[PDB]
RNA sequence: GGCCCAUUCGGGUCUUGUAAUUGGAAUGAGUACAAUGUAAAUACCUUAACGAGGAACAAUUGGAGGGCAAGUCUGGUGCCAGCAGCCGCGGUAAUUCCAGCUCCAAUAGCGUAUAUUAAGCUCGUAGUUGAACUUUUACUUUGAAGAGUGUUCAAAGCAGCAUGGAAUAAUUUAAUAGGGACGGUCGGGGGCAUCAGUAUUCAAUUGUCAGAGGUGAAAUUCUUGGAUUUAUUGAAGACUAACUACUGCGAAAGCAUUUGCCAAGGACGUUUUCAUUAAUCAAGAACGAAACUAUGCCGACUAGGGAUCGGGUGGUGUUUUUUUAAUGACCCACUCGGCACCUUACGAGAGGAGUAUGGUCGCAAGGCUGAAACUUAAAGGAA
């Protein structure tokens, strides 16, 4: 009970992952452009 | 706040290939989700899926076969240069070969290895891997 | 004999050590007959002669360790331990001393200091997000440090416009989205009247007489002008026992007698209707003595089980009953929506406890009182 979880291994880094989808800051998308 | 069609279906293929169910039955469809069922299709991330008409939005259901690690839909839809599509590749995806990023461009949707090889572009619609 | 490893004991390996003597060769810093250099001159390059063993032609900076006295100091449980030692009996041309103490690192560079990097609840405004379907612009495609070198090496120097574009964003369906309608209902939802209940207090009569309430004992209080208690009756306020449930209703706080009125609400059923009218929302609006042992990982999330409340469909045979009207209770299966309980598949969801104190600030001891400037009365205290 008390160990927490395993959360897998992380596969990305762009942005934040939402219900509505992964979201992208302005920000964001000038650095990569 | 509710989500848009996609996003939906998308999160219920997800939910469905990991708790081990064999078939997602998707509610509402929509051209953008049969397009995007067809590239996952062609890349082999799903196995047939078939659509219901209801005379309503209508509905899809769609077997899995496994292979599907992770979908979603990316937003804001930005747009991307072609030369520009291998950097965001490799920011968006596990590594440089696996998996596929989904455009919308002036020849339709397709991934982005097709973009490629037709010298089109557009903005971005979602990436499967 | 040297060196390497090893907390431990020890283990491993072989040309090593000198704090010994010695030879002839090479050359620059310098010092220079010069010449070149340059307006002249310095510097550079070249070069006669001099220029090396302490090659005294005498680079540094920093760290790690030793050891010594008829020496000095401090604390002890003899002969010790600690700090430490340019200082010793004599001596300064006196002394010849530990190897001139040993080792390690950088080196024309190397240390030091500071900083620095690795209440509550509903509604609701901006903002944000949000079902499906059948010309122009944004957007997108196309066209207008490195190569060489022989400065002796090196650092150097050196020869908006045009254009193609099918998606994406601007420029009929009747969502297991939303709203209303209709039907039988459901509810301890709300407001106004209304009804009932036993109880408490007071009062009226009324039988009897000394105690009655209260605490662990009391005190206080009532009481032969009759308390408490007994019977009958009237009035006042409050409240709604048992039925009372890990049940129902309400946005929350809350709501428990009957009957009527007033509007309101949920879910269910619908082959009725509008047709995206929506979601989340800081701001704003409506309503609105006490605590004192607790506790549950969270979520966009799968399949369930028992039980229960409200509604609907079907089955079935018992309660029910018959041309007055109404017309249910129970059992079983299915379904929608609720309050909870028990399980389950999936998910990046990004200081405590003590110890010591040659410091600073506070608080504190004692001698019998009386009683001292008084060797002093009585009365106490002690014994
Ligand atoms: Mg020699
Ligand atoms: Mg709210
Ligand atoms: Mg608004
Ligand atoms: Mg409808
Ligand atoms: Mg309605
Ligand atoms: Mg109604
Ligand atoms: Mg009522
Ligand atoms: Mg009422
Ligand atoms: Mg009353
Ligand atoms: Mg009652
Ligand atoms: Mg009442
Ligand atoms: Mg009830
Ligand atoms: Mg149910
Ligand atoms: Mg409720």
Redesign the interface.
């Known amino acids: 009970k008390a160990t927490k979880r395993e959360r897998g291994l992380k596969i990305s880094s762009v942005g934040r992952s939402t219900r509505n989808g992964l979201i992208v800051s302005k920000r964001d998308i000038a650095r990569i452009s | 706040?509710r989500?848009?069609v996609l996003?939906d279906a998308?999160?219920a293929i997800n939910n469905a290939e990991k708790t081990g169910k064999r078939q997602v039955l998707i509610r509402p469809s929509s051209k953008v989700i049969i397009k995007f069922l067809q590239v996952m299709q062609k890349h082999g991330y799903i196995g047939e899926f078939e659509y219901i008409d209801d005379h309503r939005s209508g509905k899809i259901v769609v077997q899995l076969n496994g292979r599907l690690?992770?979908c979603?839909?990316?937003?804001?839809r930005?747009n991307?240069?072609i030369g520009?599509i291998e950097?965001?590749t490799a920011?968006?995806?596990?590594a440089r070969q696996f998996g596929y990023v989904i455009l919308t461009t002036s020849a339709g949707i397709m991934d982005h290895e097709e973009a490629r090889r037709k010298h089109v572009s557009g903005k971005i619609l979602?990436?499967v891997?």
């Not at chain 2, 920011?91 to 596990?94: D, K």
Request: overall charge positive; aromatic content about 16%; glycine content about 8%.
């Open positions: 706040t989500s848009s996003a998308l999160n690690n992770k979603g839909v990316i937003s804001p930005f991307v240069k520009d950097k965001w920011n968006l995806l596990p979602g990436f891997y």
